[PDB]
Structures are given as structure tokens and as C-alpha cells.
Amino acid sequence: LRIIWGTNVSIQECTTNFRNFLMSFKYKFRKILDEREEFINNTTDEELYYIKQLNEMRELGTSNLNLDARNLLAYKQTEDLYHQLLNYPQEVISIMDQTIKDCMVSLIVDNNLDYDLDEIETKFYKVRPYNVGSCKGMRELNPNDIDKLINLKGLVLRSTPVIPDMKVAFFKCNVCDHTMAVEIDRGVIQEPARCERIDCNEPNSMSLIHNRCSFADKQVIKLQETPDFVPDGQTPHSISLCVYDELVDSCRAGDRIEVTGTFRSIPIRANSRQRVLKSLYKTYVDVVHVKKVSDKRLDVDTSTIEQELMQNKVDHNEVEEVRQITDQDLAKIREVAAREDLYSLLARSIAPSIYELEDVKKGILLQLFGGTNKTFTKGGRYRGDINILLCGDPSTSKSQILQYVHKITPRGVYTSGKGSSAVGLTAYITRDVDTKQLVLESGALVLSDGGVCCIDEFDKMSDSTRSVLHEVMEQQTISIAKAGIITTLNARSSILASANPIGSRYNPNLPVTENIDLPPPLLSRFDLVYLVLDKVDEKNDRELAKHLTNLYLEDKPEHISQDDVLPVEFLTMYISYAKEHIHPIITEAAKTELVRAYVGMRKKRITATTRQLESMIRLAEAHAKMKLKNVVELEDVQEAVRLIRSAIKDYATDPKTGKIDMNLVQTG
Amino acid sequence: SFDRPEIYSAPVLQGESPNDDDNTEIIKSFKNFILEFRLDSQFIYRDQ
Amino acid sequence: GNGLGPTRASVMSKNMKSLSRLMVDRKLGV
Amino acid sequence: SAALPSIQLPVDYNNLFNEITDFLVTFKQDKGPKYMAMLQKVANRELNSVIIDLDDILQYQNEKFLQGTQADDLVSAIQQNANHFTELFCRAIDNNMPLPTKEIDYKDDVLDVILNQRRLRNERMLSDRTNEIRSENLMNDALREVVEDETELFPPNLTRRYFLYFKPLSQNCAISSKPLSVRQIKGDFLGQLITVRGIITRVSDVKPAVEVIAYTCDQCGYEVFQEVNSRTFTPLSECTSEECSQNQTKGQLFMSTRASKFSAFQECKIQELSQQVPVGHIPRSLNIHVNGTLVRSLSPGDIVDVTGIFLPAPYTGFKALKAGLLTETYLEAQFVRQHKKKFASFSLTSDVEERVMELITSGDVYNRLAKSIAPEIYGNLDVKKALLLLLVGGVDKRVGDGMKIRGDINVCLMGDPGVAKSQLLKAICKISPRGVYTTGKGSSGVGLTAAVMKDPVTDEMILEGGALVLADNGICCIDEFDKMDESDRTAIHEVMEQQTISISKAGINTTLNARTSILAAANPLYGRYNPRLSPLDNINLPAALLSRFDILFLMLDIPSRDDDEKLAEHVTYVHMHNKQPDLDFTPVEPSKMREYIAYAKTKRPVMSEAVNDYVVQAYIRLRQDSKREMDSKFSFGQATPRTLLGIIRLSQALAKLRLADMVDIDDVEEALRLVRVSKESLY
């Protein structure tokens, strides 16, 4: 009996149901739940899932269990526990923490394990439900949804410094120096009105010692909603998330995160002088789980968060920054990398629904892989970010290729050229409405750090806006010296720009540089300049028309209209593994081929600067990273040179004058 | 041009242990004395 | 009833003890 | 007595409450009583809003009069003083509230279980008083009446799950429904239930406004509730229950958000329509307070009849300018009537169905709907067909890779002066439920973007959308297309391809959703078509802006004898009689056209192999024909993969207009015909 007032939750029944779920859950239950019974493999989907998780947490010393809420729907006894957890997250999560402690104690005692029970008993175990029902955006939540477990998805814009939240107030007597330690209770600390010592009973002798109190970490994070459903006429919304005591600093600006937390409302005092609250409550989210890994997205660049990864180890936050690759997945990755057509398979796996553009999708793949990041022991840095420009005739799917690389990249901002400003692409000063203070917010090029910034309409953006991209495309930094901000900000973001030539058509009469219409200093920064031309070829029309019209045969198309394309789930994992674990090293034969080719190109018309040698190297490295090779041979350099030449269509360009021979184009 | 907001309460839970000195405990014990006292099998104070 | 019982931990969290004050009979709710 | 004197008003609330109860229990003219059916639904938790029709009350009074009984005018009393009758009707519904036939389970709302818990708790405390007094041994009527004097129960407003609203009595079925302008709402109408006709210009976010804030005391175990009436409130510090007030050791009481009473609150701003503003005046706005389940029913740009209680609020202006007891005013919204029903809120009810069959059975739906678009505009039938296709739009396709195809038709009308391109734009704006008419190089530079501001109601930074954002899932009719700024043109490019606006400026980094169909009207280079000059030469559109438009009409005004004679007969007939000349053809009412188009937009026809093969062949032939003429004085810009998707979109729109699920050869034929005749006016 004895349910909790205001809730359906009964401590005994909920504890029993959650314990039964923990002891007797296998992932085949969820596979049956998701109507995926033919994916059920007896080897790993028939082991108790949470028993193994509890054992791993006991062995590793961690304290946080990541509970998939939908799993509770798979189990019959916890079909109601799912609704209880969603409706009453506080009570249910407290009961779940207690149940986790009991479960681990039972695992140690009942199996008679050697593990000490002292440090288990004194440890506080926490549960992190994440995969709760995903719907209703954030603006469609009514006041009846207050104090409910909700799931938001969005982009991190800003994060306040670590705020101390007092948990224990330390008072001291001004007379006898006797101290009590009051505990906070629902945000209220009972200040003593008399010294509890029987010797002296001075009324106002007690004074709060701020620096000797006990404090905990609190952080407010500014998030932009990216809901699955967007009602007509509304604009993007910003909300404030609250992370507590282990989740502080786990989210950086520019991160795309799915956050599960309690939808809370607080009354805001109208003035700082009097105690009067406003009748209109302010809504926010108490974060209980953060998911920074998407199964259809590349992993974050580990070379940019090494300090953050190891700070995450000290913080014991247990936030999964990069997805887990199992032994079977690693074997599959190696088997696919051992294929003879690996390059063409990965190229056509990039945006399967865009028509054949083999070099554009091969350059995109190499940019996704990137070069090798070389840090100098004596001071210096080379970044393997590859900048690609897609200049071409209108209607060539340049924008669909930028939209895929924006969706597939871990971090990055999609800009439109004329809608961007020099200040907008870098750090700027804004005003917070909560604190009424002046704060710094990142720009598009800073939020894209560690990812790819997609810039559409690269020709339409002005000369002064384009000035900030020079330092990013060359040094991968932004050295800002403005009123209030004087520092160097890492901007290690590849630049994927799209543009059409002047007149909105590639006139063959004019040379390449006249059509592109970009200053030598910016056209050199692009590692791969693609000329995407819309030639009238009858078979090309025949096949592009079948491709486009096949997408309309079924209401929601499942695209398998190729020999074979890897799923984005496998493709992203392969690319992330290659980026993380493969660091190609240039060999001497590769060096000779590189020097050979650079001198060959170094012999109006588009120039060939020293930056082209540096695009070769990194491009070659990208190729060497694609095949999981730790060294670069001359084949990779030859492929990089061939890609560079074919991107600008040198096979149809007269060496003397930069005319494109329309009859020599190889659309195919 | 609105009216006076009202304030009202309702018992939901057992609070802190009834303490013997609390005015409400004293009132309860006086009420029990009035209603339950018997002299020669007569509720003298209730009848009075 | 049966004769055995689950192995429960000894240390009770502060939140779980606080929830014990709010208990009401199941004749209310479910 | 001498102070606060009593007045004798003709309103008796006891028999008015009796009449309210009788109407709620006995009215059944709209198997049993309508309102107890509604309260039975509310009890079982299928409904959380009670709408009291004033037409129903008027009909009940009329029936009572017809049978000889003299009934008080409940409708007039509600209209004159509506705030008291919400209070009254809530009490009457609580008295006649049916028991729920469905038990409380784990899938019910937390508010429902809280209300059930407090209802059971108060009935148990009643029973406990009763048992205690029975044990005390001091008639059941007196016993009960003692019990309700010694019980502190949860008041009915705390055990209340529904919301009460007053629907105004219809003009045909007739004061509270005749539409008033913002100016016409003086202080005499204050306190009454009135209807205001206007356009919504700003809607705030739905926030939780506290009405009865709840606290729990750890000393006596009581729940102390404090009602909130104003903008700000002072929280309670010490408990005020019976036990703590009687005791000397008071208990400090903490807020309970889950036990507090909240209301979904919105503060919309209605504005005078252009037909309501007097000569030489600037329209003035009115504040609408939307509460309860009625939230999210008003959006900016909506032309609505909002019926609500006109109520006063405490003064918020400068204190030095206060002369007396000045009060701000707002409209506590009770009902919303949309002049243009949104395409998303379409439901195939019986009356919607009968109208659609009476439209279909008349035959020739495509031509009737096309010719009914601005029927006083004469002789632009391909133009009206393309506009109708734009209104219907194609079928939005999301490929599994995450790719999206636009699904919406952009139409550009480049033409000579005096050809009715601007009149066709306002016709489409009138037809479209979400239509925004803008003029280039006016004040739409910020209009084709969103502007970040502060919400005055809620302390947040929100960016209010402009023309391209307010016309989301609608139509933006841009007149003088050839005369916009470069930033506006780039924004239009982005809207027409990806249906989004990417802004990276000082203070903002967002991707606004603009799922807008663009209908542009443009003048040719030099303002008049020069047939001596090339069509692309006379078109001041970048090959990439021209490519985006699914159809580009060239509306040329060539002089003639018969054509000019026929235009002049039509225009002169329209000037005599405010209607089109033709008697055989009757135009479709714009409300019945919106209902057909809303029904048509619910269909998602797909293309078979037998139709897409021809689509491929036609695309190949079009590409070859475009290649054969690159500069032959008739070049329209060579065909592109965008023309294939425009052909596909037009075919899907034509299939939708047929209410079909198969894209048939007739629709592709007509799409190719429309694309071909988009350009035959040059010849």
C-alpha cells in the first residue's frame, strides 16, 4: 500500500517491478517490441542486458547507469513503470537509484563475489533515462507537462561558468565560535536565530561563513530547439537547461545534443529589492541525460576534445562522446576496407539519392575523412581540414550535397552567404535576458570547429565578409581583437562552399577564373575546386530522369537504386573509426611523387600556388586514411592529383587559355 | 478592478508528532474532558 | 510468504526517506 | 451601511442559477441532453473544455416561452455581465457532474489523478467528521450540516478539470456576436461578452500562469492554497492553517508546483482591419488574454472574430499621467472564429463532404476552380490554372537519406503594364489562408527575414518572423519582383530551393523554416516587352532565379480588335454590376474553393512506371529542344533537372485536384501543356 500523495507511485511496487526488470531483461524483448524479430541473434540479445551493465559498472567503478526508457515498454511488468517514470521523474528516479544500489549489493552478496561492500554501500548510484517519448517539441508543452520527463533535441549555443549551489550552510558564532552546519531543504536554509550551545544563547551571534560552506556545481546552457515537427509561422526557439554536479561542462557550444530532463517552472522575482514573484512562471529543463552521439552522424573529432575527454574522466561524468565500436563491427569495418571497390562504394554511399557525381562525392568523402593533424613538439600545428568549392551551372545538386554534409557532420553551421556577416561568423557580444549581462557568443565559423561549415551562395557574400574566411581556411584559427575580446579562437572547420558563375551559367567563352570570380588569395585556399557543368547529353538525361522519378514511385522512398550502398549507420561509423585510429605517414616515394606533380602543375589561367602542394599531401593522406592505411604510397598521391585535375576539368581546359571544351566534358 | 484573493487550507498528511503542549493538543484534551468525563455514570459537563 | 526474500541494501538515501512522509492509501489513485 | 450603500439591480442570481441548472439538465434539442452528454465525456476524461452555446440558451428560452413558462433572459444577463456567469455555470456543472464510467489508470494525466486524489480525500474527511460526531453522541440533516461546517475540504475550483467558454449566439440565429472594431470597443462595453473582428499581429508563447499557488507545511501536514489575481504576488512564509494558526510554533511552508493550479496563458494582439480604420487614421490594437485549452488557436496574420469578456486591468502607464482610477483593458478570449480556415485543420465531416460532392458532380472541377480565381479578371485562363496549381501545390517528398524535395510550386508572372498581375496576386492572397502580399523595395527588407526582439509578456528574446516567415506553409505574393535588394533576392533564392532562411548575424545564428510558395509578379526590362530583343535579354532574372520558378508566364499586352472588345465588355459589365459578365458559368465561392483545396491537399498521389516513363521521355525531348535553341531569339533558358521536378510537381498537383491517388497521363499532359503555353504569348 502507501502510494505517494499526488502520484500513482508506490515505493514497494515500483521497486519490485524495477528490480524484476533489471534482473530479467534481454534486448530481444525490445527487438520484439520494435517489430524487428528477424534481427534477433542468440549471442548478445539473449544475455541479461542490465546484469552485464551492472557488472561492468561494478568493475569500472562508475556510478551512473544509462537506462533506455523504451526498454521499460518491452518488459510486461514495467509497462506502467514507463508511464510512472515519465509522469513523476523525481520519485521514480529516486526509487531507481535506490533499486540500483540494492541490485548491485545483491549481485555482490548472492553470487558471493570478492568485491568489498564498504565502498559500494557509500557510493551514490544514479539512473539516466534518455529515450523517453520524443514528440511535442518544446513550445507545445502545456503547464500540465510541468515536472514531467521530456526529451529535447537541439544545438548548444552558450554555457554559463560553474555556479556554486549551496548544499550545506556553515554558520559560526561571533561569541563562542561554535558552528552548526545546516542542510538545504527545497532551496531554503534555516538560518539559526540562536546559538544552540547551552552555554551562550546570544540571539544574532551566528554568522554565515560563505567560503566554508559546501557547494555543488550548477550550469545553465542555452539551447536552440530543432524539433521534428515545426508548426507553420514560428521561428527557432531558445531554452535554458540546468546541469548539476557531473554534467557541468559536458556540453560545449556548437554541439548537437539530444537532452532528456525534467520540464520545470520557477517563479521569477520582479525586483531585487522586494520579495515579490511574477505570476507568469519561467520554464526550463533540469538535465538528467545528454546524448551527444547520433547513429546517423559522424563522431566528434577527438583531436579537438582531448583535453575535454580527459577532463570528462576526472569529472566521472560518463558522457559518451564517441560511439562504441564492437568487435563484430570492427571486423565488418575491416572486411569492407578490404574490398576492391572500397573507394567507389564509399563515394556512392555519400548522398545515395543524389545522381551520379562520382568526383564531387569522392571529394566530399575525402573532406569527411580529412588529412592528418600534425602537432609540433617545438610549437606548431598542421590541420588536415579540406576546403572544397563547388562552382557550377545552376540546378546541379550542389545545395543537396551541402545539406547532406551538414546533416552528416558532427558540428557545423549552414550559412547562405548574403545572410552572413563578418561579426556573425565570429564571436559577438550579446545580452542575456536572465542575468541582464553582456556575454560572448560564438559565430558560425567557431560553432563549426571540429566539423564542416557549409556556405551556400559563396559568390553572393561580400568581400569584407569573405575576409574572415582567409585565416580559417589557412591557419584554422580566428585571431580576434575587439572591444572586450582579444584572443585566438580555434576554428578548425572544413569549408564546403557552393557557388554559381557570373551570369548564373558557365559561359565557355570566358576562362575559368572569369566564371568563378574569386580573388586568387581565396581561390588558393580551396583544396578542391569543382566545376559542375550541366551538359545536354541524351543518356545523362535518360538516367537522371529515371533517378528523380524513381523517388516518386513510393510515398516515402527506400533508396537502393545502385549496385550496393552502405547504410549511413555503417558509413558514419567507418569514417569515425578511420578518423580516430588511422594517422597516415608520408613515405619517401609519396614525397617524390608529390614534388614531381607539384612541379608539373607549376608550369588568363588559374594559378597553382604553394597551397596546392599542401592540398595534395592532405588529400593523399585522406585517401590513405580511407583505406585504413597508416602510410601514404604513390598511389594515394596519384589519386589526389587526379582528383584535383578532374575537379577543375583540366582534361577539357586548353593549357594556353582557360576555355572548357564543351564537347570534351565527361558527364557520363 | 479585481476582488480579494482568498487563502484556504485542507489536511492531506500527518504533520509533525502532535506535541503535548501544542495549543491544539490542549484544546483537544479539554474537549475530551468535556465530552467524556463521568461523575456517578453521568456526563455532568456535557449535560450542563 | 514463499520463505525467501531479495537482498536489499542497508543504506537508505535521503530522498527515499523523505518520500516516506508523503505516503497515502491506495484508495486514492492507483 | 451608510458607507458601501446597497443598490437594487434587476438581476436575481438565485433563479438565474436555477435556470442555468435546468438548461444544463433538460436541454436536448441539439439521444439525450447535449450538455450532460458533454459532462459525461468530461467525467471520463475525453474532453477538458465546456463550450456553452448562447444559441442553445436562446433556443431553450424560446421553447420555454412557447410552452407558456416565463423564463428569465439568461442570454442577455450573460452578455451584459459574463464574468459572473462563468463562475455560475461552473458551480452548476459541478452540481450535475456525472460519475466517471472509466477508472483511473496509469495512462491518465497527472492533473487527473491529483484531482481524483483530492476528491476522494475530501469525501473521506467528510466521512471522518461524520463518524467522529456519531461517536460523540450529542437527525442526519443536522449531522451533515455540522460536518460541512467542521470540514476543510478542497474547494470545487481545485477539483475542477474542465474549462468553461461562452460561444456567442449567431447573427442568423439571433449583441455578443456582431463584430466590433477596436475603436468601437469603448468603456461602455467593459465587462460584457463582445466579439471583435480583427487581424492578429503578435502572439506570445504559452506560459504557465499561476492561479492558485499551493504550499505544503511540514508541521501540520496541511496544503495551503493562495489565489493569485494580479501580475505579481507575494509568497506565503508562515502557515495559515487551523493547526498552525491555533498553535504558537508556526510551520514554514514550501511551494508545491505539482499541486499548484496553472493556466496555459497567451497574450495575443489583435489589430483593426483596413476596412475598419477611419479616413486618415492609424489602426489601433487590443490585448487578448487566451487561457486554458483555447491557447495556440491564434497566430499572427490570422483574420479572426474573437469573442471574449472585455475586462479591465490595473493601470500600467506612467504614474504622473494617472488622473483617477484609470484601468487598462484586455479581452478574455472565449471563442475564436477563423475567416480563412487553415488547410491543416481540415476534417472530412458530413457538410464538408456534401459540398465537395456537389462541386464534383457539377463536373469540370479544374476549369471551374481556375476560372473562379478572380472572375472579374478576364482571359487569363492558363494564368489562373497555374495559380490554382500553386494553391494546391505538389507532393512533398522526404527520401530516406534525409533528403527533402520542395513539393511546392513557385510561379513568376512577368508581363506588360495593365495586365492584372497585381490583381491576380491579391486574388491569391484572398484565397490563401496564409497569404502575404509584399512589394519589393518598400519596407520588406526586414520583412523577407525575421527580427530579434524582446517579448514584453515573457522575459525572453524571440525573433518575430517577417513576410517569408509569416507566410509559412502558405503563399508569398511578391509584387515588383525585379526591384528588390540583393539580400532579399538571396533570401528568396534560399526560400524557393531549401524552404529555409539561414541567418548568421551579430546576435543570431538560426535556420528559419519558410515552407512558402512564391508567386512573383515582375515587369520586363524597360517596363514593356520588346519583341525585337531576346526573351532572356528582356527578363531581368538570373538564370538561377528563373530556374527556381516552376512556371514563368509572359503576359504580353498586344493590341487587337476582338480581344480588346471582349476585355472592355467584361470590365464595363464589372463596373455596372459588381460581378462577372458570364451567366452560364457561376464562380465558386472562395470559402468553398478553400475547402476543396484543403481536401485536395490531403491526397498524396504517387507516380507509376507507365507515367514516369513518359515523364522521362518528355524531359529528354525538352532538353534536346532547349539545346537546339540557345540564342535563336526564342530561348527561355535551357531546360534543367529543375524543369523535370516542376513537371512532376504540376502533375502531382493536377492529380490532387482530381482527388486521385494515381498520377495519370492526363495530368502529365496538362502539366506539359501549361509549361508549353507559359511561353506561347511571345509568338
Ligand SMILES: Nc1ncnc2c1ncn2[C@@H]1O[C@H](COP(=O)(O)OP(=O)(O)OP(O)(O)=S)[C@@H](O)[C@H]1O
Ligand atoms: N544530379 C542530381 N541528382 C539529384 N537531384 C538532382 C540532380 N540535379 C538536380 N537535381 C534536383 O533538381 C534540383 C536542383 O538541385 P539543387 O540542389 O537545387 O542544385 P544547385 O546546384 O544547388 O542549384 P543552384 O546552383 O544553387 S541554382 C533539386 O531539387 C534536386 O532534387
Ligand SMILES: Nc1ncnc2c1ncn2[C@@H]1O[C@H](COP(=O)(O)OP(=O)(O)O)[C@@H](O)[C@H]1O
Ligand atoms: N484582363 C483583364 N481583365 C480585367 N481587368 C484587367 C485586365 N487587365 C488589366 N485589368 C485592369 O487593369 C488595372 C491595372 O492592373 P494591375 O494589376 O494593377 O496591373 P499590373 O499587374 O500590370 O501592374 C486593374 O484595375 C484591372 O482591373
Ligand SMILES: [Mg+2]
Ligand atoms: Mg543551390
Ligand SMILES: [Mg+2]
Ligand atoms: Mg502592378
Ligand SMILES: [Zn+2]
Ligand atoms: Zn555561541
Ligand SMILES: [Zn+2]
Ligand atoms: Zn502548518
